[PDB]
Design a protein around this nucleic acid. Structure first.
Ligand SMILES: [Mg+2]
Ligand SMILES: [Mg+2]
Ligand SMILES: [Mg+2]
Ligand SMILES: [Mg+2]
Ligand SMILES: [Mg+2]
Ligand SMILES: [Mg+2]
Ligand SMILES: [Zn+2]
Lengths: 189, 52, 77, 191
RNA sequence: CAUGGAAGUCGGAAUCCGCUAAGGACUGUGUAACAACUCACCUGCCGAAUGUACUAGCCCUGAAAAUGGAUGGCGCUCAAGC
């Protein structure tokens, strides 16, 4: 547990030097997203999150270095990380909000909102018509391109997406999911 | 011929089993002790070998 | 590319482990092309990486690529 | 080593009614009524809160304490069955000889019975009659599906096992002859 | 490095560093090979015990013979057994 011991001194060393601490609620986000935001904020500020700190901040609350830690004691519930930076709070309000990825469906993901395909020309190879015939979508091949004459409802809002439609959604580059950084309440603002 | 998923479903009930080495009893795949009393709940089990 | 002499044809049928190369600033110069593609802070980690990358070659003479990368005593550039 | 106090609780939704007398449980709700007799187990029942049933054992042994979770799950299954019902699905698997079934309707009483013909190309006509309260359907959703549905898990499952156990191959290598009828899915009627 | 090809995954010998709480010269599948998927590993939930060997008391398997049958008999289970 060498890294376990190494975490303690890093947390206590880092908390005292930086007067501003920002709380981030990150959940089910791809590793590459944290990689890119880490490289983007490499020059200014260091981001680090870990396991729940049941007593590791309570020990800093016992001694008087920061009487305001015990005000922040109840704020930790789960999957909440901390960001240590020296920039202004106004400038960091929207700094970490960049690079919202377009998450594809996962073969049954619940769509919060009704998903519709606008009228247009798909333009792909007409060998894929078996996929359309699986769902029974009225499609006409024009100039070697599959065209949907009439809009067909894909899945109702809040209902499980069909596996065939979900697979077609990947190559259609349309999805109801947009994953991005979550901003939590900080310092009772 | 049998489509692969049905063949797997049928194989689940009569191919993936454990065999006791004392009374030749059929046991679940993850079992560790025979359930019959005439072998003394022995723990000498071997997998049922597949057909090939 | 550095390898050893030329990898003449019809010679790779047998063992082809004769690819020993020198360990010097030539590899550090070649590291600038990569230029710490994956983070590596100011590229010190990339310098150690590229130095220990030729672990099969075992650096040159007594020195080893792993020992050279492990010993943080050389200049940054 | 005897444990002084062991207790468990069951929440109850605001849809059904339950009454117990002499360790005999009666559960009745929107989809019907069920009965169970538990006179063979020494358990103390109580009403913990407005919608929670508690049950417990005092000074029990390890073997006696073991049955407490079994009782809890049986009554919970009764609650599930009376508020959502049960539904099993089964599939037919044959290689050469198709197997034909005939689920004729009620035979002047509530019991259903299913007739099976042409198993591994056999001319036996074989008949099994299920317990009352189980409804059998031939699926129209897709091909070669049998649907069993009902209120009680024990009866639905037992009838399905009767169907599974009646189609057996004798004097043959069963790793090669995979002919038969097998169960494939378990779930509730609603959702 | 060999290589239709083998970006870990005919293969040979090596086996490092970046950034992390963790995510590999790869744990398999997959594939021309990759990718993909998974695994490992850490974290989101959780809410107090766990795992691995050994020792000896009772009980059970090991335990098959010829007329019908003997803890002396009936019978006995918080014993009427040890
Ligand atoms: Mg034979
Ligand atoms: Mg004995
Ligand atoms: Mg005796
Ligand atoms: Mg006597
Ligand atoms: Mg006594
Ligand atoms: Mg006496
Ligand atoms: Zn056995």
């Amino acid at each position: 547990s060498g890294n376990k011991a190494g975490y303690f001194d890093k947390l206590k060393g880092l908390l005292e030097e930086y007067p501003s601490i920002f709380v981030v609620s990150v959940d089910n986000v791809s590793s590459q997203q944290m990689h890119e935001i880490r490289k983007a904020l490499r020059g200014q500020g260091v981001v680090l999150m870990g396991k729940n700190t049941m007593v590791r901040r309570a020990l800093k609350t016992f001694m008087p270095d920061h009487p305001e830690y015990e005000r922040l004691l109840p704020f930790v519930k789960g999957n909440v990380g901390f960001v240590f930076t020296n920039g202004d709070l106004k400038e960091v309000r929207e700094k970490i909000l960049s690079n919202r990825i377009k998450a594809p469906a996962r073969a049954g993901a619940i769509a919060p909102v009704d998903v519709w395909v606008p009228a247009g020309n798909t333009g792909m190879e007409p060998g894929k018509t078996s996929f359309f015939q699986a769902l029974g979508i009225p499609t006409k091949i024009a100039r070697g391109t599959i065209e949907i004459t009439t809009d067909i409802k894909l899945v109702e809002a809040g209902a499980k997406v069909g596996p065939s439609e979900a697979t077609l959604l990947n190559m259609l580059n349309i999805s109801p999911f947009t994953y991005g950084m979550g901003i939590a309440q900080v310092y009772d603002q | 011929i049998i489509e692969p998923s049905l063949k797997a479903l049928a194989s689940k009930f009569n191919c993936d089993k454990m065999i006791c080495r004392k009374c030749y009893a059929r046991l679940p795949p993850r079992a560790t002790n025979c359930r019959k009393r005439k072998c003394g709940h022995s723990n000498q089990l071997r997998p049922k070998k597949k057909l090939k | 590319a550095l390898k050893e002499p030329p990898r003449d044809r019809k010679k790779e049928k047998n063992i082809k482990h004769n690819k020993s190369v020198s360990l010097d600033e030539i590899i550090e110069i070649a590291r600038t092309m990569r230029f710490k593609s994956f983070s590596k802070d100011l590229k010190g980690g990339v310098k150690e990486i590229l130095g220990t990358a030729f672990s099969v070659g075992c650096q040159v003479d007594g020195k080893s690529p792993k020992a050279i990368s492990d010993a943080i005593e050389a200049g940054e550039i | 080593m005897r444990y002084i106090h062991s207790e468990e609780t069951i929440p109850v939704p605001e849809n059904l009614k339950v009454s117990i007398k002499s360790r005999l449980v009666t559960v009745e709700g929107p989809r019907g009524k069920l009965q169970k007799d538990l006179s063979h187990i020494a358990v103390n029942f109580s009403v913990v809160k407005k919608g929670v049933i508690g049950l417990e054992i005092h000074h029990g042994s390890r073997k006696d304490v073991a049955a407490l979770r079994t009782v809890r799950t049986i009554i919970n299954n009764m609650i599930i069955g009376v508020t959502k019902g049960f539904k099993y699905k089964m599939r037919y698997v044959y290689a050469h000889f198709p197997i034909n079934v005939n689920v004729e309707k009620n035979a002047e009483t509530g019991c259903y019975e299913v007739e099976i013909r042409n198993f591994i190309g056999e001319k036996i006509v074989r008949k099994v009659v299920m317990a009352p309260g189980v409804e059998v359907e031939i699926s129209k959703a897709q091909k070669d599906e049998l649907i069993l549905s009902g209120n009680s898990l024990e009866a639905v499952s037992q009838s399905a096992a009767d169907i599974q156990q009646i189609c057996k191959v004798r004097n043959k290598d069963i790793r090669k002859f995979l002919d038969g009828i097998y169960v494939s899915e378990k779930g509730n009627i609603v959702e």
